Amino acid sequence: TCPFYKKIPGTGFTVDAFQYGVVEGCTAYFLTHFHSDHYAGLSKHFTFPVYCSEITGNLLKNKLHVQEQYIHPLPLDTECIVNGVKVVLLDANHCPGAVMILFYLPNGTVILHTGDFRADPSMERSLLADQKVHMLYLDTTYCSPEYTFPSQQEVIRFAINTAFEAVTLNPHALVVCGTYSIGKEKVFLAIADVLGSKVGMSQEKYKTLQCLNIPEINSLITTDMCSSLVHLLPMMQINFKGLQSHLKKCGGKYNQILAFRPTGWTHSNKFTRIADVIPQTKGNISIYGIPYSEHSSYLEMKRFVQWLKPQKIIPTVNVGTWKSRSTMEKYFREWKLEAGY
Ligand code: NI
């Protein structure tokens, strides 16, 4: 059944709750972003109001074929009324179109639902600065102190420098980048920009990217693989067998592959710096795992929460085990005693 952490009390609303059939008592279904564990269940047969960003609404219409009459896109940073209740959508610094949602309950309670987010100090100057938030529905993906990772900027500088050096040393090297969802577009776009190429990809992935309102996108991507020396492939193909196979397909245009796998966290984060990352190599194929995250590190999460000072925290990730739930509740209490709220 629908878990309690997907329901907004005092309303008829749910958040990211599309796989339970008709949730009894739900008058509006909000969708924070277009990732499959969150939209799971939506299709052209859905006949309840969906509230989301413009970009998420473009993906719902073009990829899932949800009918236009049920898609209700809202502008960001704007007070809107939904079924009698004031709401605001805020940028979540996750993937394109991802939002956090502020609910102002008729009784005076204010609720923030982060969706998935990568906390940033810029959020401390949004509309959140303007009033107290009582309850926080928090993306706790990386809520443990082992999870450190570099800034997105540091990671993109590493990728751009690595690719440019390799292709300038060998003009017959191909660059390949893995993907299995929206998000992390800066990785392949920044590498293609330094190389003066468009990124080549499948018709399905091109259609997806054309929904994202990215400026000048027609100048940056293409379905013509032959004209491109940065290719995108399914993350599943980013291994030596899949890449050897891909190289055969390019008809002797290339004699070397340099590939990137933008993972979340991996245990080499506890020991190694970004300047010291090395690839896995077999023959003329090299694969780099780069720690490009679209979720909060532990320290970013802790700074946001100690700033916001909520009265109550409801985790939305890692909630399925008693050991994970107890660990998280211990950190929440530490943070509250340290900061004095
Ligand atoms: Ni997500």
* Domain ranges for the chain: 1-147+296-341, 148-295
What is the whole-number distance in angstroms between the Cα of residue 116 and the centre of ligand 1? Answer: 5
Sequence-separated (6 or more) residues with CB below 8 Å from residue 229: 167, 173, 174, 175, 195, 197, 254
- The CB density around residue 131, as the number of other CB atoms within 10 Å, is 10
Sequence-separated (6 or more) residues with CB below 8 Å from residue 108: none
What kind of experiment solved this structure?
Answer: X-ray
Query: 86 exposed, middle or buried (CB, 10 Å; 0-12, 13-18, 19+)?
Result: middle
| 82 closest CA partner among 8, 139, 19 | 8
Please give the angle made by the CA atoms of 102, 311 and 111, to the nearest 5 degrees.
Answer: 15
What is the whole-number distance in angstroms between the Cα of residue 253 and the centre of ligand 1? Answer: 36
Contact between residue 140 and residue 116 where contact means Cβ atoms under 8 Å apart? no
Q: Which CATH number fits domain 1-147+296-341: 3.60.15.10, 3.90.1300.10, 3.40.50.80, 3.40.50.300?
A: 3.60.15.10
Sequence-separated (6 or more) residues with CB below 8 Å from residue 95: 33, 34, 35, 116, 181, 182, 183, 184, 294
Question: What was the resolution (in A) of this experimentally determined structure?
Answer: 1.5
| 34 closest CA partner among 56, 54, 19 | 56
What is the whole-number distance in angstroms between the Cα of residue 32 and the centre of ligand 1? Answer: 9
Q: What is the DSSP string of 185-224?
A: HHHHHHHHHHHT-PEE--HHHHHHHTTS--TTGGGTEES-
C-alpha dihedral (28, 59, 218, 75), degrees to nearest 10:
0
What is the whole-number distance in angstroms between the Cα of residue 50 and the centre of ligand 1? Answer: 18
What is the whole-number distance in angstroms between the Cα of residue 317 and the centre of ligand 1? Answer: 11
> At the topology level of CATH, where does 148-295 sit?
Rossmann fold (3.40.50)
Q: Do domains 1-147+296-341 and 148-295 have the same CATH topology?
A: no
What is the whole-number distance in angstroms between the Cα of residue 284 and the centre of ligand 1? Answer: 34
What is the whole-number distance in angstroms between the Cα of residue 264 and the centre of ligand 1? Answer: 11
Residues whose beta carbons lie less than 5 angstroms from ion ligand 1: 35, 116
